[PDB]
């Protein structure tokens, strides 16, 4: 159901996700990279589903698609299956001990 | 040739989608989302709730979670009354909006 | 077959999706959402607007609503100029962003 390099996440309506980088990347760069790879930054529920599946490693922070304000965006941290929310300015690349990784999601093919 | 899974209902607003009421009891945000994800769907976003209210699939005077955070600790709810909608927000652990219970509704794509 | 319906354009950015400018004059948030819902779609989200700007579908110096709320009374807008985007927020009844009319854009899934 997913293109080469993507993974079928079986939560909600199953979708396809991919960790796009191992480097800490800012918000706009994350979104643009994912858009160039035929996908989008995952929303809140897709992040929660990937965390519940174990697809996202424990204690990992990623940018989700929601804005916190005109100059900030929300991050989701995944640890031991549970999710927590935060936000940062568009230019931030490191959420405490975790570099903020870009994760792309897209529909089933 | 059914447009939805059994237990789900086609809402003809925007691109028609499939909605289902998960529970009749007030439920917090995290449990709402987890139950929707475990029922093959996800929490309805703002426009899906507006469509379900305009169609009448959501009865008058109904408060339900939507899939947008209000801050790191809160999420938005939508109240539906007399065919019109209004937005509010509440902490994750909250299960009640005034006299109304915050009910979980799930949405997914038309099949 | 055709990826989009008559009037809608396939946007080749992110998950490729069908889009349509719903009006040429400033429209408030609620009327924008209602027009989109009544014409088979919904207000585009943040990444859909960013893609439409990066592909050139959105002309330069264009402000449009998106589907996210900034609070219970306001919604976010995206302005596209050159290849780049910026985020603002305005009350539901606002029609103009500075000297830019707030235009409604509808988005939906392909095929």
Residue numbers in the entry:
A (entry chain A): 519 to 627
B (entry chain C), C (entry chain B): 517 to 627
Copy text from the publication.
Bdellovibrio bacteriovorus is a bacterium that preys upon a wide range of other Gram-negative bacteria, entering their periplasm and consuming them from within. Proteomic and structural analyses of vesicle contents reveal several fibre-like proteins, which we name the mosaic adhesive trimer (MAT) superfamily, and show localization on the predator surface before prey encounter. Structural studies reveal a variety of domain usages (and therefore binding capabilities) at the fibre C-termini, placing these on intertwined trimeric β-prisms. Using independent but complementary approaches, we identified and characterized a MAT superfamily of trimeric fibre proteins with diverse adhesive tips, able to fulfil the long-sought-after role of multiplicity of molecular recognition and handling of diverse epitopes (across a wide prey range), by the bacterial predator B. bacteriovorus.
We next determined the structure of Bd2740 (residues 517–626, 2.6 Å resolution), whose fold was previously cryptic. Our resulting structure reveals a variant of the C-type lectin fold, a widely dispersed superfamily named after its use of calcium to bind sugars, proteins and lipids. The fold has many structural homologues, the closest being snake venom agkisacucetin (PDB code 1v4l28, 2.1 Å RMSD). TopSearch22 analysis indicates that the majority of C-type lectins use a different face for trimerization, and the only homologue to match Bd2740 is the major viral adhesion protein Mtd from Bordetella bacteriophage (PDB code 2iou29), which binds host pertactin on its upper surface. The largest pockets and clefts are upwardly facing (distal to the fibre base) akin to Mtd. These observations reveal further potential for utilization of known adhesive folds at MAT fibre termini and show that these can diverge over time into distinct variants. We found that Bd2740–mCherry did locate to the CpoBBd0635-containing vesicle, deposited during predatory invasion, while Bd1334–mCherry and Bd2734–mCherry fluorescence were diffuse throughout the B. bacteriovorus cell.
